[PDB]
Structures are given as C-alpha cells and as structure tokens.
C-alpha cells in the first residue's frame, strides 16, 4: 500500500478498497 | 482514532485494516 | 454537512451532491 | 466567489446551496 | 487545462483524462 | 519525474502528455 498520508475523502476511499466485502467504520472524532 | 494514525501520521495496509468490520 | 474546508475537485463534487437535479455553476475567479 | 467562502473559510450546507441554479 | 498543482490521486486522474485511449505510466520516484 | 514537474510546480496540458504512452 501507498506510503503517503491519507486524509479526507481519500482516507475513506482507501478504507473502501482495503476492506471490500467486510466494510468499515469511519469515526473521525478526537 | 483513524485521523491521528492515518492522516496525522502514515498508515500501512495493516494499520488501516483494523478499521474494517 | 462536513465541517471541513472544501477545495479543488472536492469542492465541485460537494456542489454536485448538494444541488443534484438543480445543477450548479463553478466560477473560481477573484 | 466560492473559493473565498468554501475553500479559504468553511461552508455549511446552505452557504454552498447559493451556488446552485 | 487547470492552472493548479496536481498531486496524489488527482495527478493520476489528470493523466487518465489527458491520455485516454493512449494510456500512461505513473512512476513517482526521485 | 512527474512529481517534481506537475506536483512541486505546475503542469500545462502538454507537459503532462509527455507522460502518456
Ligand atoms: Zn484530494
């Protein structure tokens, strides 16, 4: 996988590819 | 969360898969 | 809607979602 | 224009809808 | 074409549009 | 490469077409 900082909608799209049929959760809070 | 690991720092394929279901 | 700064092609894609069947105009000039 | 409001500052759902037709 | 700095996946998507049926090569190394 | 021309600087339509096949 790419060696860059993944942010915004690119981070969500990374998660989409990497999980696939498993799906994911994006909870961006501190 | 993920915005401290994969955005403020860099994430490999595995540190990102921990955010799958 | 998201509380971030929307720029470039992400700003145009925000406008696409938010208007839909109304459409939009993107004129980026100062 | 929109690049001073929604990119240089932040835009809510309504301040962005003023750029629809 | 746009007068901005094209990076990341946006640079690859620029190359996709600009070449089309010719295709391209993306080799990001220094 | 392309990351020094089109990302660190700006590329017109032609300087980007040199990266096609
Ligand atoms: Zn982007």
Swiss-Prot record, chains B, D, F:
The chain holds residues 90 to 110 of 110 of the full protein. This is Insulin A chain. Disulfide bonds join 6-11.
């Amino acid at each position: 996988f790419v060696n860059q900082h993944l942010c915004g909608s690119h981070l969500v799209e990374a998660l989409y590819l990497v999980c696939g049929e498993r799906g994911f959760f994006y909870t961006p809070k501190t | 969360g993920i915005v401290e690991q994969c955005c403020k720092s860099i994430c490999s394929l595995y540190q990102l898969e921990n955010y799958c279901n």
